[PDB]
């Protein structure tokens, strides 16, 4: 019923080195309009790193912003993460996690003057 | 069958001040384990500002890091996005949104040596 997730890549980079993560979905796909990257170093609690919406929308936790990119081939079904400009801080394992996002409200509308 | 949301909060406010929005959800609760805010301002696209899920996780857009803070109560399953020092770059209509996440997979090791 869900869909089906592929994580691939990872394993050793030197520090200063890139690495690029692959997730790869299949199944019930249609249904899904956001991926998402977390991480655990170990000890920790596990993180948001990375999203991204079917609108190409994305964002990034703070400690990888400007280094990490989190991108998508919508055909295949395919989200990347690259991983540039690493350190040991950076190791730890890292997850792929699907979402489905509901409808758009009419919203709020917000004036700041001056 | 899918969760109601009702957004509050907004209007007016000067520079320099702050605004907090609300969204409260309602019927088909259980599935839901993700938040989030975005924003258009006139003419651009549509960005993510914020979003949080179950855990407690968030994750913030660049522009409003630091500035915005999104917080749930999970009891009454409402969802808050605390704004401060805004600025007439904040103008826009925001809307809150609804996700149910996926499945924890295994995940992928990464480890940076040196
Ligand atoms: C942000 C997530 C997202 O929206 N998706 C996604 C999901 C997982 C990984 C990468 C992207 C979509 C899932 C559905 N596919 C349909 C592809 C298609 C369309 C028309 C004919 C044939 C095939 C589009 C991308
Ligand atoms: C991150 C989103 C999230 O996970 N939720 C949420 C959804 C919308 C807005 C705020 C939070 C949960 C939805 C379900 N509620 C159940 C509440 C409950 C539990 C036990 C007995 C009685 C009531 C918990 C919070």
């Known amino acids: 019923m869900q869909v089906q997730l592929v994580e691939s890549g990872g394993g050793l980079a030197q520090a200063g080195g890139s690495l690029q993560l692959s997730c790869?979905?299949?199944?019930?796909?249609?249904?899904?309009?956001?991926?998402?990257?977390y991480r655990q170093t170990p000890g920790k609690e596990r993180e948001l790193?990375?999203?991204?919406?079917?609108?190409?929308?994305?964002?990034?936790?703070e400690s990888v912003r400007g280094r990490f990119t989190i991108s998508k081939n919508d055909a295949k079904n395919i989200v990347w993460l690259q991983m540039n400009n690493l350190t040991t801080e950076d190791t730890a394992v890292?997850?792929?996690?699907?979402?489905?996002?509901?409808?758009?409200?009419?919203g709020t509308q917000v004036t700041v003057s001056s | 069958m899918q969760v109601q949301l009702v957004e509050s909060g907004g209007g007016l406010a000067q520079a320099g001040g702050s605004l907090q929005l609300s969204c409260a959800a309602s019927?088909?609760?259980?599935?839901?384990?993700?938040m989030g805010w975005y924003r258009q301002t006139p003419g651009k696209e549509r960005e993510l500002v914020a979003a949080?899920?179950?855990?407690?996780?968030?994750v913030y857009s660049e522009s409003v890091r630091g500035r915005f803070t999104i917080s749930k109560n999970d009891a009454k399953n409402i969802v808050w996005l605390q704004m401060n020092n805004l600025t007439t770059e904040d103008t826009a209509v925001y809307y809150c949104?609804?996700?149910?996440?996926?499945?924890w997979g295994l995940g992928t090791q990464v480890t940076v040596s040196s």
């Open positions: 949104r609804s996700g149910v996440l996926g499945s």
């Open positions: 019927g088909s609760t259980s599935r839901v384990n993700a």
């Open positions: 949080i899920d179950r855990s407690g996780a968030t």
